[PDB]
Each structure stands twice: as C-alpha cells, then as structure tokens.
Amino acid sequence: RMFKITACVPSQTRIRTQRELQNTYFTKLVPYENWFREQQRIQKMGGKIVKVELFTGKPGVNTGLA
Amino acid sequence: QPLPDQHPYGSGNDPLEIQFGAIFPKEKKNPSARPQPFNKDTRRILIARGPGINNQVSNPGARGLTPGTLGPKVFKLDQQRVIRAAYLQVFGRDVYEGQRQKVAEIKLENGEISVREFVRILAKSNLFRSLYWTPLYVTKAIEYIHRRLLGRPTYGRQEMNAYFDIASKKGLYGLVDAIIDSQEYSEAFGEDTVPYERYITPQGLALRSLRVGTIGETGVP
Amino acid sequence: SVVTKSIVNADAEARYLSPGELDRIKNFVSTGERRLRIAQTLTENRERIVKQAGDQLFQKRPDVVSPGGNAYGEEMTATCLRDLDYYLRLVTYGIVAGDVTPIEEIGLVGVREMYNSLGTPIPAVAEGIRAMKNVACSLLSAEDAAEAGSYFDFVIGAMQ
Amino acid sequence: SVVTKSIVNADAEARYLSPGELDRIKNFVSTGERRLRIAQTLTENRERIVKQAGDQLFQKRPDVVSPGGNAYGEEMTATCLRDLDYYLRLVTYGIVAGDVTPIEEIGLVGVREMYNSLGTPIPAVAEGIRAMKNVACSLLSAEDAAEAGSYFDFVIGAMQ
Amino acid sequence: SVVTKSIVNADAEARYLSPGELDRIKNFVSTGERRLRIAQTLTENRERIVKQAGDQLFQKRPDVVSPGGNAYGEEMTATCLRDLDYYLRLVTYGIVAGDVTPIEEIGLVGVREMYNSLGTPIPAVAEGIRAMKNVACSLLSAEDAAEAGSYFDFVIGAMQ
Amino acid sequence: MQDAITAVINASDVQGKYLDTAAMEKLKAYFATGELRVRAASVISANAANIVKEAVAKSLLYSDITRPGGNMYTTRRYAACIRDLDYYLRYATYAMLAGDPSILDERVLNGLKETYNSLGVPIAATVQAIQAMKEVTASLVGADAGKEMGIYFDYICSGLS
Amino acid sequence: MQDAITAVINASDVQGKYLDTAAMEKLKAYFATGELRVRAASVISANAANIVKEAVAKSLLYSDITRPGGNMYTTRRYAACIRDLDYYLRYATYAMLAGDPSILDERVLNGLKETYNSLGVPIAATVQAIQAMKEVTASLVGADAGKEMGIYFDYICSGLS
Amino acid sequence: MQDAITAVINASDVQGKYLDTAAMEKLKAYFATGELRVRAASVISANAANIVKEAVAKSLLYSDITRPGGNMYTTRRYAACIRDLDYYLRYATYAMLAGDPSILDERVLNGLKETYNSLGVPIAATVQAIQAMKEVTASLVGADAGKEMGIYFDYICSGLS
Amino acid sequence: MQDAITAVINASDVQGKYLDTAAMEKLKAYFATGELRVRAASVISANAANIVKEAVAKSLLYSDITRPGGNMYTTRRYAACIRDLDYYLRYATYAMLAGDPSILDERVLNGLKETYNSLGVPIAATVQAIQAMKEVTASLVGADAGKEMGIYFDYICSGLS
Amino acid sequence: MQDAITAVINASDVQGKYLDTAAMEKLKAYFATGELRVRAASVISANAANIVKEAVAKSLLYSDITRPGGNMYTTRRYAACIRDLDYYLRYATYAMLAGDPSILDERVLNGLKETYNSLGVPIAATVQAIQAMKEVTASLVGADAGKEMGIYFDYICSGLS
Amino acid sequence: SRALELAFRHILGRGPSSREEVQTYFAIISKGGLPALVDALVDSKEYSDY
C-alpha cells in the first residue's frame, strides 16, 4: 500500500536563481509506512497536500494485509 | 602525546579512504593495534574535503554550500546521470551488468521517487549488503556505511553507540534508514542531491596529499 | 502464504521465482494435507488448550492473579484467557499458511507497545504462550507437533 | 547453501532464525542423501555430458566453430569445452548445497563482463549449458532430473 | 583550467572524456596563444594598472586613505596597492588558465573573513578592482579586453 | 560467511576438482547432525532473553563488575553489556546452524579485542559471562547439542582473550 | 565535557557514597570562583574578534607565513587560520567556565598534531600565536581570569607542540 | 586534480611572481602539444575494451592466475581484474590530457599498494598487465602520443610496485 | 632483501620453471647497469654527510620545524632528524646497488609511518626533506644514476605518505 | 595452565564449599582413566614421528600444497610444516595427560591465527592434516585413547578454523 | 625499532621498560647495528645480574 499525493508545498523561499518550481508543486508516491514522515516534511514546508489517494484498493486488512 | 586521530574503538576500525573497497586492517593477519582509551563523547578532527571555512564544526549553518572546485563534484537532480552517481557513491564502482537494480528500482527517471529514496533502495539492496555488511565486523561495517551514505567519517562514540543500538535491534536496514533519515543527511545532501564525500580523516588526507606529485610545497617553505 | 511472500520478494529483485523458492512452494503444496490436518485437530481442541494453558500460566505466576496483577477479577481473568485464544487462532492461521506473515501482521508487530499501553506484562504473556505450546504439542501428533512447536517458538521469541 | 542464505537474511535483520527458515533448513538436511547421489552420478558422467553437449553446441551454433568465431581451432574449442566442464562442476556444487548461491559466487556474477571481454557470445554459452541439461536429464531419473534441471535452468537464465 | 574541469567532470561519472568535453579542450588549447598574449599585456603593464587604479580607488573612496582610515600613510597604502597587485596577478592566472578556479582558490574563497579580520572595507576593495578593470580595458584591444574583463568581473562580484 | 557445506565445496573449488567421495562423507556428516542443530537453534531462539539473563545473574551480578566503579555499574553500561551478550548468543546460534565458526570470525572477532581494550571492558569478566552462557545453553538445548554450542562459545572466548 | 561539579559528583558516584562534606567544600570553592569565570566569559565573547585580530597582528601578520608560500598566504588559508585561532579561544573559554581541561583534551587536542602535520600547518607558529592570544586575553579579562585562561591556553600549547 | 597549466600557475603563485617568460614557455609547450594529447584521448576512449582485452591476453590469460587456485580464477575475480585494468587505463588517459600525474596520485595510487596487499592481488602480475596495456595503446595512438602516455603508465607501474 | 638477481630467480622458482631466456634478458640488464650503480654507490658513500647537510639546509632549516616547539627544535631532535635522513640515504643507496626496492620495504617503510605518527614527526617535512636529498644526490652522482636513485627515494616518500 | 583437578578445585574454592560429591565424581573419572592416559602418552612419544609421516602422506603430500608456490614447497617450509604437526601432537599429548584444554589455549591458540595468517599458512590444509593425525593416533593408541586424544585434536582444529 | 624490541626479548628476557631505554638502544643500533646492540645488551649489568 503506497499513497500518492499532490502537494503545493508552501514556498520555502530557498531559491536564488537555482529553481524552486519542482519543489513548489509535487506529485509523489509515498509508502503507507513512510507516509508519516512525509506528513512531517509537509508540516515543515507549510503546505498540506491538495489531493491524497492510496494506490492499494482496500485501506485495512487485519491480517496478511501486506 | 595527546589522543590520536584513530576511531575511538580502535585503529583497525579506520578504512582506507580510497575510491571503493572497504579495506580495513585485520586484527590477526598482520598484528597491529594501538588501543588508546577514548572517552564517551570525544570528537574526531575531520578535515573538510572542501574549504575549511565551510566546516560543520565551525560553520554549522553552511551545510549544503557546495564544496566547489576545492571538493568533490556534487550531483543534483533537476527536472539522468544522478542514477550513475548514486551507484558510484553508494557502492563506489559502477556495479556489474547483472547487479544493476535497473528500471525496477530506477523509477527516478519517471519521477515517482526522490534521490534520497533511490539511495535508500540501493543501500538496502542485496548487493550493498553482501559488499559492505555481511563480510565486515559490525562496527567496521557501521563506519563504512556511514562514510558511503553520509559524506563523513563518524565523529565519535556519541554517534557510534547510537548507530550501534539501532544495528543490534534492526540490522542493516535499520542502520541504513537511521543514517539516511538523520538530520544531517537532510541538512547536507537534502532530498534531491546524491551524497558526496564531505569530510576525510587526516590519515586519508595523508594518503592522497603527501605523495610526490601531490605534496607540491606542502610542508616546508 | 509462503508463495505470496516469495512472489513479493522476487518482484523486488525483478526475478522470476528462483529454483530454491520454487522448491519451497512445491513443498508447501506437498505438505498442505498435513497442514490442514494439524489445524483441524488444534481447532477441535481450541477451547481446551486455551483454558488449561491459562490455568498453567496462573499456577506458575501467582502474581498475575494476586492484587496488583493485571488479571484481577473474573472479567480480567477472562480477558487474559482470550489473549491466549487470540494467539492460538493466529498460530493455526500461520501453520496453514506455512509462513509467519499472518502471525506477524495480525498479532505480533507492536505487541510490546500495545501491552505497555494496556499495562500488561509481556513476559507473563510469554510464559502463557509457552504453556499453550506444551499443551498443543501433547494434543497434536508428536511428529506434527515438532513443526508446530517452531511456530509457537517464534511467537514467544517475539514477545519481550 | 540454504543455511547460509537463511543466516545472511537473519543477520542483516538482527533476527534469530525464523521458524520458517528453520523448517527450510530441516527439509534440506533430510534430502541430503538424494542430493549427494545426484551429484555423484553427474560427476561420474562428467566426461560424457561435456562431450555430447559440446557436439550439440557446435551443431546448433556452427558460427562459434566457423572462422571468426570464438571457438575456432582445436585449442579454442578445448577451452570452450573446459568452460562447459567448469559450469557442470558449479552445477554439482549447487545441487549439493541446495542453493544457487555457490554457482552465483563462483562463475555467475560478472559472467557477462568476463565473456564480453573474452569475446565469447553469452547466448551461445547458454546453448551449451542447455545441451548439458538435456544430457544430464537423460542420465538422471525423472525425480532427480527435475531438481538438477532447475540448477541448470538458473545457470542458463542468468547467462541468457 | 578547462582541462581540469573536463577531467573532474569525467572522473565523477567514471567515463572517458565525452566528445563534447574533448571539443571544449580543443577550443581552449587552440585559443591558448591569444590567452597568453592578453595575460602578457597585463603582466608587462602591471605597474601602470595598479598605480592608475589605485589613484581612481583613492579618489572615489577617499575615506580609506584619509587619516583614521584603513590605508593611512604610505606604509599602509603600500599594502593596499599590494593587494591590488595580488588581484591583478590572480586575473592573469585566470586568463591563462581559461577558468576562474585559479582566482577563486587563491584569493576569493574567504575574502570576507580575511578582510573582516584585517578591518578592511570590502566594498572599497571592490571599487579598486573595478578601477583596475577599466584601466586594463584601456591597455587591451576591445575583443581581448572583453575576455579579460570577464575575469575582473568575477572578482568584483565575489567581493560584493 | 562459510557454512560447512560451503566450506567443503569451496575447498574443492579452489583445487578445481568435482566433489570427491571424502568430501561427500563430510557433507553427509553435516546433513546427519542437521536435525539436532536446527532443534537447538529454535530452543535458543525461544529462550534467548532468558539465557542472557541467567548468565548475567550467574557470573556478573552481585560482583565487583556491577557494583559502583566496576564498569557495568551505570545503567547505560549494564544495557550495553547485555546487548553484547545478546550479540554473542545470536552469532553462536548462527554458527551452530552453519556448522562453522567463520561467522564468529567475520562478524564478531575481527576487531573485538581492540574495541574492548580501548573501551576498558574487562576481557576476563566477559569470558566468565560467555562461559556461564555456555552452561545455561547446554541445559536448555540438551547435552548432545550443548557440545556443539560449546565449541562456538569457546571460539568466541579464544578470539576475545 | 566534565566540569568541576560533574567531576566531583562523578568521583563521589564511583565510590558509591552520597556527597560528602569534603566534596561539598570543593563544590563551594568552584561556586566561589563562579563570578570571575562567568564575567570573564562574557568579556571574551564580546571581544572575541578583537582578541584574534590583535593576536594575528602581533604574531602572524607581515611575516613569511602571510607572504607567498608561507601557509597563511592563500585567502582560503588565511581565513582558515583565523578560524583556528577562534577555535582555541572558544574552547579555552569553555574550559575556563567549566574549570576543567577535559573539553580541551576530548575535542580540541585529540589528533590536532596529526591533522596539522598532515595539512602542513606550522605547529610552532600556531603555538606562538596562541601565546599572543593568551597575552591579549589576559589583558582583557584581568589578572584573575588571565591566570586561569593562561593555564588552559598553555594546556593547548603543550599538547599542540 | 591539477593540470600542467594549473601546475605552472600554482608554482608561480607560490613564488608570488606573475607568469614569467620561462613559465610562459612551459605553457606554450603544453598548449602546442594539446592537439596530440586530445586526439590520443579520443583513440583510447574508443578502443578501451580492445586495449584491456589484448593486454589481458598478452600477459594474464592461459596461466596460473586464471586457473583454479589463482587470483583471477572465478568470474567474480576476473571481472574485478578487467575493471581495475580499465581504471588504470582511464586514469592514465585523464593524466595524459592534463599533462600531470597528480590525478593518478590522488585518485588511483592513494593506497593502491596497501589494498592489493590486503586482498592478495599479485602486484607483479598487475605491473605486467599495465605494461602490456602500455604496448597496445602505443600501437593504437601512435608513437608520438605513445611516449606521452607511456610516462603515465610507467607512473602507475612504479606506484603499484 | 631481494636484489634483481634474487627477484628474477625467485619469480621463476615460484612457477617452478628453470631460468627462461626472457628472465636471462632481465638478469643481463641488471649486469649491464652494474658498473654505473657501483660507481654511484661509492660517490654517495663518500659524500653522505654532505648530502644530508645540503638537504637539511635546502628544506628543513630556517623554518617552523627548527623554531622552539617545532619538533626539530632542541639539539636532541635536530640530531635525531639528521640521523633519520642518513638512514634514508643509506638504505636508498643499498636499494640502488641491489636494484629492487625490497630493502626499503623490509628495513625502512614497514611500521615507520606508525612510529612517526606516534612520536609526532611531521610527515610532510620528511617527504620534502628526502626529495631535497634526491636533488642533491642527482647532482653528485650524475643524471643517469640520479634517475635510479630517484626511484627508491620516491618509494620511501610513498611509503611514509 | 589448569589440569582437570585444578579446574575442579578452583570452582569449589570460588564457591567456598568443600569438594562436593559431584566434584568427586569428576575427579574420580580423571583418576580412573589415569592409567589409560599415561599408557597412550607413552605410545604417542614412541610413534610420534611416524604419526606425522603418515598424516602428511595422507593429506598434504602429493598435493597442490607441495607444488611450487603452494606454501609447503620450499624445503624450509616443509620442515617447518612437519614441525608444526609435531607441535600439535605434542601439545595434544600434554592436553590429554592434564585432562583439560587449557594447555592448548594458553600455549598453542593464543598466537596461532596471528602466526598462520601472517605467514600465509593455509588453515584448511592444516585442519585436514590434524584430522588425519587424529585418525592415525587413534589407530595406534586404541579407541578409548583415540576418543580422548580426539577431543583435543578437535580443539586445535576448531581453534585454527 | 622492532628489531630492538625483539632483541630485548631474546637476549635480555624482557621488553623495553621506558622511552629512555628505547632512546638509548635505538641510538646504539643506529650507530653500530646488530653487533653493537648485541654487545650492549649482553654487556648490560641487567644481563649479568639476572
């Protein structure tokens, strides 16, 4: 179960020349196990994901979900 | 004399600072060991493969300012060859043709996964384990992985014990994620940059920089 | 199942199933009848195993039912016996599967955290499952019980 | 070996060997007698296997023995047959071990690199090992040939 | 240099110099003769550039040479003019080398630290180098002056 | 990282020979002892924490080592010591399964004495504890498998000393 | 980094006994010197750049070291040298506040000789410049603190030599 | 990494001199011979696999090293040998382009003898292979750039010796 | 020690082969170089003290090494350093006579780097000093044997590095 | 060094208890086998040279080990190898007489891997030779002494591994 | 240096005890080599006493 979410991460203002468009808008695939760390990173950025979805069809299996 | 520059655990725990190989001294093959007592929270003096003004000990903020022409090349992904660099840094050599994780792990070209996750995949891969975890005594392996994944040799026991408890309870995969999730990997190398050699121990600089042809004028006026 | 675990592991390396893993799933297919038989007999004795093993747990550890023990009162004693029954249900699932993947996912990952929040002593749970292992071994056929003891061993080892 | 692969995975995950991995080792140590018998027949018939399979390789791929091919001339053909002998020796090792990792460690890792350097065509070498599998299957019983053939199959698959 | 830039980039990827890299080296070695000539004019006129640019710097920023300023008296004004000579020398190195790496290594990494330790006003140093750039343009031909001006521009940018 | 089977075939490989009949006999010996080795390994897996706890109680607790100033005194040091004993027992179990002390060589003893000497860990006291772990393990797994575990514990002691 | 208070409590802990009256006497002594130590640390922190500027001017500037090929020549190397002088001042100030040379031993002097000898840094000149810093610091913080900052600066020089 | 151009300017920098007539003559020589260096680099780049192949054949194949019980025996080890031979060739070509052996010193030879002594790699056989590459690449690139290459190949040979 | 003769014969002995015609060519080359080598050895033998004197003047003297706290300061240490430089000269001349650097590896380099790092000897200064000895020796013994002495001097530099 | 009596007495002494009946049983077994141990030891002393001769012939002779470059090639190396087999036999005899492996650990196995790994001695071949010595010795001394001497031969084998 | 330490073991029956011992006898082996060091160690009062 990997969750794919699109986040317009709030501007970190960390770009002088360089480029910040790729960081500014992100479409990514995140494992459900690692999604908590992704949420923490989104908190540091300041922007919540506009859209959140999970690739796996069913959210919970009590047993052998893997 | 005062304390030396060796790893706190021992001289043997210092790998040759070479391009690739994990060439550690063996405790028994040619007996050589200088067990010097290192305190709980000492710190190695790590020369910076770059400008010494930019040193994490003195300029802790400027982690991420590029080494520049005074240091290694820094590969960053913009949107290619970052994949090649990640192989050449996580392992050291370009891996053999069958050993490539190939497109199965290289979804980076598509953009699904960031370079931080690509190096995590390579670090947990079975090839990396066989090369740098299975054949090496534990703390020697912890050291070599820290040098390959983070840019720097381990500072002291404050880091070795903290990365040793993780290894004892979670193994190579746990230690790898601890290193790659560390605050320092995000501060330097971010989540877009291939890791690069950020520091070297003084006897690695001795090997590189004091051979005839590299010493130049270094040592006498 | 062993097949499912093997397929996922091979998918990660992008390899068709290796000869050794093919042999492992072949043997799982071969031993399926014995697996189902073991599950059926333990299921027949499911209530008996849990209840008498719970008695053995209380007998070995009097502090469990003493004042200050988590299993104080008939309702709490019932909850402790129920936990033993839960693990037996998972063990039968795992015996059928031939793999510990069900056992791990359902009832072992974070067992320290869950029981710490509840206040329950995991070491006491470990002694209870050890008693269940012996009881189930006696009721099960001796040759089959040798295989089942390994899976009980995994559960008790994970407890700590 | 099965034991070394199990230990390696458990070592990399800081885990006393799981019950399923222990079961895999148990099955392997029991089948040991049959494994060693299969290896004995193959090494005893190694001369016949290499000779017949070499004839098949040259017949199927005349270009390798044609002028401009890698195995042109008696000495080059002799080294090609020696390589086939090497790979048979590796397959016997793998059969005894019950795992393909002895074959992988010795002769299968970097085989593309080595043969590309030498100028040898890798798919043609795979043809030779396939021919060796056919000859060995003729020399083995059906139950034996299925197990030994799997190790031949891994060799040809890695060298495909 | 440009040879070093090419070789460093090639070494990082473990590849022989790409044809594009080699193209850059061929251009640089073909243009080397004019590069050496431009540097030679600067070295030959090393006294004129420093003297006239020193006067322009002292006019535009009189505070540094006034009493109470950093460069007061001939003893310390000599050191200021010496630093202007240092940076002219670095610029000639850069013209010959074809890259700003000589300049940056020798005298632009940590100028802020060094001059802030000596007390010197860095913006005033920048004015001095800009004056050197203008004087050098007078000496040099327009096409050549553009090439040398780029290296002077790198220096002034670094000290701003 | 050689088990007994891998060691036998590796020696044959270096010589360049197909597996000899004597090598077959050695392989047969490993396969013959395999059942008892696997059974003891599972027993140690179940009793892993208890083996270490009993060894610490039998050899280290209520002694100079754990009383103040003894290098196991502080709580961080006690946790570190039991972690090392866990490491010893786990790799001894791996060695029993494999039939070879090579895992102990590569993964435990390749630098252990230098690390212990540098840290200040008393080698003799650790050796006492490892010996006590041998006694406890022999009881738990049975005497017949206890002789097999004993050789690998002795390997650790010889390398550490 | 063991300070005076941490060292005293650690020694009492090693013996195992609660804090003794004699240990209280030592702790009272350190508390007594706390005023001079804290005041001096504040002075050093504010004037740190000036301490180093005066020391560099007195010892290193307008010598061969700062002229071509002298190891303080390149702008990189000059900035690195002043950074090192800042290191010695900062950790000497830490040591003065603590009342203990442990921080110097543990972080500053460990492998300093080896790093400097590998880099090509003149250790004699670094010793002389640290002496210049010692004199400037003594002037700024007065004889009370200069006596103590002297012992920690001289600790650095003795190890660095 | 330091070219002949960077070497010339750095030597003048150490002396604190503007590029003089003698050093400018050195630079003129390098700039003039750069065309030959560049073309030879292209030749070796294209024929890298062939150069390594012919060298491995001329000195290493059909011998003890490749037969069982030798170093290059096993496909693993053989692939490592050809990899290292290409590394020696690639870095030699870098060095020819630059005009200085510093790239070889810093990147290749910085511990090579110790690594080969640790793994058991035969230093004499590696020297033979590199000298074989020297012969083959001399044929491919011609004598004029073959001599210029040969000095750097000899540098690697001396270092490994 | 292996001289060139012993190295050739031992290399043949390892294979088990009688001295081949190619090996005879190697031995003939050594015998051809014999006269110039012996002559140069006598030159160094009589001028050994002058070589050390000139080298210590060229590099080591009037630097931070000989100022107080510089490691060559104190007459004991200045005497010790000139003793070590004469060690290098004597063993390098031995190596010129024998034709193989195994004397350097056996009698000088093995362990010297560790002792030097332990004692605090600056290693860059030692390399610069022995390179200065190479310049002086090239002058005294002439270019052709200066070519030869350089190989062994460079060997010592690389070992110390 | 500890014999079985020393170990039993010391264990009882640490506990403080007088020699317990179980300890008496251990000592009684050692005393009871005393006649067998002494008898076998005399057999070893008389037949030791031929035991070694047969064992070397069984495994090491006519093998790659005695081939040129095989590490028992040289006459020096052959003489030393048979000496070491004599050492193992002699110390195994000592270990049998004492009834405890402490002689082996104190004298034979506190430098064995260091010496053999440094020399390049092939541990696998030595292990095969010592196993062969065990079989030959068991034939000469009989089964009861073959078992006892066998455990000590196995001790040396595993320690070498 | 290693030769000196081995010589102390073989000829004197102990290892060097202090830097002054190592300084003294390293100077001896430097000035006369193995014949000199052998003479110095056997001549030593320590040899005669023990």
Ligand SMILES: *[C@H](C)[C@H]1/C(=C/c2[nH]c(/C=C3N=C(/C=C4\NC(=O)C(CC)=C4C)C(C)=C\3CCC(=O)O)c(CCC(=O)O)c2C)NC(=O)[C@@H]1C
């Ligand atoms: C100044 C008085 C002298 C001098 C110094 C000089 N030092 C360096 C470089 C380094 N110095 C250190 C030392 C430390 N690192 C630390 O973390 C600490 C805190 C305990 C110390 C004391 C290190 C590691 C370096 C390497 C570069 C770096 O900082 O990472 C240089 C630079 C050398 C170079 O070539 O880059 C210099 C010039 N030089 C002098 O002339 C003075 C006598």
Ligand SMILES: *[C@H](C)[C@H]1/C(=C/c2[nH]c(/C=C3N=C(/C=C4\NC(=O)C(CC)=C4C)C(C)=C\3CCC(=O)O)c(CCC(=O)O)c2C)NC(=O)[C@@H]1C
């Ligand atoms: C009391 C509140 C609980 C309890 C405790 C109990 N403790 C022990 C034995 C030991 N306790 C320690 C702990 C420490 N060592 C330290 O250095 C420090 C900090 C300074 C601590 C806290 C140690 C080392 C031992 C054993 C060795 C020793 O001699 O100290 C026991 C005995 C364990 C046994 O089976 O032998 C017990 C029972 N028991 C309780 O019921 C309380 C909840």
Ligand SMILES: *[C@H](C)[C@H]1/C(=C/c2[nH]c(/C=C3N=C(/C=C4\NC(=O)C(CC)=C4C)C(C)=C\3CCC(=O)O)c(CCC(=O)O)c2C)NC(=O)[C@@H]1C
């Ligand atoms: C326990 C029987 C004895 C003991 C040990 C003790 N050890 C440490 C710390 C470390 N131990 C190791 C050992 C290993 N590392 C390995 O990779 C392996 C093989 C898997 C082993 C055995 C290491 C590396 C450390 C260092 C970690 C650290 O930073 O400490 C300590 C801690 C010392 C401290 O000061 O914290 C102790 C106390 N101590 C005893 O009293 C027993 C006799």
Ligand SMILES: *[C@H](C)[C@H]1/C(=C/c2[nH]c(/C=C3N=C(/C=C4\NC(=O)C(CC)=C4C)C(C)=C\3CCC(=O)O)c(CCC(=O)O)c2C)NC(=O)[C@@H]1C
């Ligand atoms: C002139 C444009 C400005 C100015 C400068 C000024 N500088 C100094 C002193 C020094 N300057 C340097 C600079 C360098 N060292 C280098 O290696 C390089 C690169 C090659 C540079 C640029 C150094 C090292 C010194 C110290 C003295 C010395 O060289 O030994 C002074 C003297 C300052 C003093 O008080 O001593 C001055 C005045 N002053 C101005 O007014 C201009 C704005």
Ligand SMILES: *[C@H](C)[C@H]1/C(=C/c2[nH]c(/C=C3N=C(/C=C4\NC(=O)C(CC)=C4C)C(C)=C\3CCC(=O)O)c(CCC(=O)O)c2C)NC(=O)[C@@H]1C
């Ligand atoms: C035969 C199936 C095909 C073929 C092969 C061919 N191979 C070679 C040369 C070599 N092959 C090896 C192979 C191995 N070395 C190993 O260590 C292992 C694993 C244990 C293997 C499989 C080696 C080392 C060589 C080099 C020579 C040597 O052994 O020293 C040749 C000769 C090529 C040449 O000119 O050098 C040939 C012809 N040729 C065919 O046509 C078949 C399809």
Ligand SMILES: *[C@H](C)[C@H]1/C(=C/c2[nH]c(/C=C3N=C(/C=C4\NC(=O)C(CC)=C4C)C(C)=C\3CCC(=O)O)c(CCC(=O)O)c2C)NC(=O)[C@@H]1C
């Ligand atoms: C080929 C001519 C000979 C040979 C070599 C051989 N080398 C290895 C393995 C390694 N080689 C290195 C060397 C380098 N590291 C570097 O950074 C550089 C310069 C860029 C070099 C040359 C290292 C570190 C290793 C070990 C890690 C690895 O395997 O890559 C092997 C394999 C040995 C092994 O144990 O796996 C071999 C066989 N062998 C020969 O027979 C030739 C004479």
Ligand SMILES: *[C@H](C)[C@H]1/C(=C/c2[nH]c(/C=C3N=C(/C=C4\NC(=O)C(CC)=C4C)C(C)=C\3CCC(=O)O)c(CCC(=O)O)c2C)NC(=O)[C@@H]1C
């Ligand atoms: C003066 C009374 C006589 C004399 C002496 C002279 N000495 C030198 C050069 C050096 N002298 C020393 C001496 C010492 N180093 C020490 O560590 C100590 C003890 C603390 C002493 C006494 C050194 C090291 C040198 C070398 C230069 C340096 O210091 O780095 C010279 C110069 C020699 C030369 O040509 O280079 C001279 C002339 N000369 C006389 O005429 C007097 C009789």
Ligand SMILES: *[C@H](C)[C@H]1/C(=C/c2[nH]c(/C=C3N=C(/C=C4\NC(=O)C(CC)=C4C)C(C)=C\3CCC(=O)O)c(CCC(=O)O)c2C)NC(=O)[C@@H]1C
């Ligand atoms: C012949 C003149 C006499 C004689 C000899 C004889 N020797 C052997 C067996 C071996 N001889 C050697 C000798 C050497 N090994 C060396 O490394 C060297 C120096 C380079 C020498 C001389 C060895 C090693 C063996 C063992 C077998 C082997 O080579 O691996 C035998 C056979 C003994 C047996 O029965 O096993 C014999 C007969 N025999 C005579 O009758 C002559 C008087």
Ligand SMILES: *[C@H](C)[C@H]1/C(=C/c2[nH]c(/C=C3N=C(/C=C4\NC(=O)C(CC)=C4C)C(C)=C\3CCC(=O)O)c(CCC(=O)O)c2C)NC(=O)[C@@H]1C
């Ligand atoms: C024989 C089975 C194998 C073998 C052996 C071999 N050994 C040596 C040299 C040494 N062996 C030892 C070992 C011991 N010294 C002891 O005092 C004891 C008992 C306490 C033992 C076991 C030592 C110290 C040496 C080196 C010193 C010496 O020469 O005696 C060699 C010589 C190696 C050399 O050339 O220097 C050899 C060849 N060789 C084989 O092929 C067998 C597999």
